[PDB]
Design a protein around this ligand. Structure first.
Ligand code: CL
Length: 269
């Protein structure tokens, strides 16, 4: 009865694996419109149109830092675009604009007959992710475009931590030992500012500022939570309500918080 549900019934093991159920292909965007470069990852056999996610790196950084999210998320039934910004030194507001330009072009390619993603995207269902200033930009995107279905930035930073207006379901990945954007000055005040949304705070035990980037040692836990969050809120898929909203009870997590995360038959502890 859910028109957006895709793929098999999830398990902890199926979500911790590096590869989800769907075959993934990818291509380079030949003329980026409003951003520097992009790679689009897509499932060939998702069983219907899927939502789209745009992911942005941090200051000085490039697609390599965020690339692993492409195959991880696309294999569970999403079209994912990872971008390079017009300049590696762009600030969060510009990163937000370029993130939204990448989503716009994914929608354009969905209607372009020659494109590998022709007709593969539900353009009414989109999400935003990104690292550090690109995570700040993701929250700016969410604040300015409340029809976005989900946000999941990692080690986010912005010159202001006040995202009180955000109504988009937002998962904040935090890195416990972040010295660039320390948790108590960045990720946690950002999380605490949001009182109008479903939200979650997931702090990775012992993580440096790059703890959610390509090659990290927690792709099982981080990927499981990212996929479950995007599935629950971009697809309204309540098969993922538990994976999305529950404390994962992992030795790799040093701090877990969540609010307005709908769970039937939840305990009271
Ligand atoms: Cl940054």
């Amino acid at each position: 009865t859910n028109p957006y549900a895709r793929g098999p019934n999830p398990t902890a093991a199926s979500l911790e694996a590096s590869a989800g159920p769907f075959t993934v292909r990818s291509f380079t965007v030949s003329r980026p419109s409003g951003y520097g470069a992009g790679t689009v990852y897509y499932p060939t056999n998702a069983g219907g149109t899927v939502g789209a996610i745009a992911i942005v790196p941090g200051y000085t950084a490039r697609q390599s830092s965020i690339k692993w999210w492409g195959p991880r998320l696309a294999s569970h039934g999403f079209v994912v675009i990872t971008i390079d910004t017009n300049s590696t030194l762009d600030q969060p507001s510009s990163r937000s604009s370029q993130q939204m330009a990448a989503l716009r072009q994914v929608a354009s390619l969905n209607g372009t007959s020659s494109s590998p993603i022709y007709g593969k995207v539900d353009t009414a269902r989109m999400g935003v992710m990104g690292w550090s200033m690109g995570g700040g930009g993701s929250l700016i995107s969410a604040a300015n475009n409340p029809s976005l279905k989900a946000a999941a930035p990692q080690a986010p930073w912005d010159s202001s931590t006040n995202f009180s207006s955000v109504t988009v379901p937002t998962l904040i990945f935090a890195c416990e030992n972040d010295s660039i954007a320390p948790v108590n000055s960045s990720a946690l005040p950002i999380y605490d500012s949001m009182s109008r949304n479903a939200k979650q705070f997931l702090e990775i035990n012992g993580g440096s500022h790059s703890c959610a980037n390509s090659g990290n040692s927690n792709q099982a836990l981080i990927g499981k939570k990212g996929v479950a969050w995007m599935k629950r809120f971009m697809d309204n898929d309540t098969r993922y309500s538990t994976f999305a909203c529950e404390n994962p009870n992992s030795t790799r997590v040093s701090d877990f918080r969540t609010a307005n995360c709908s769970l039937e038959h939840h305990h009271h502890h």
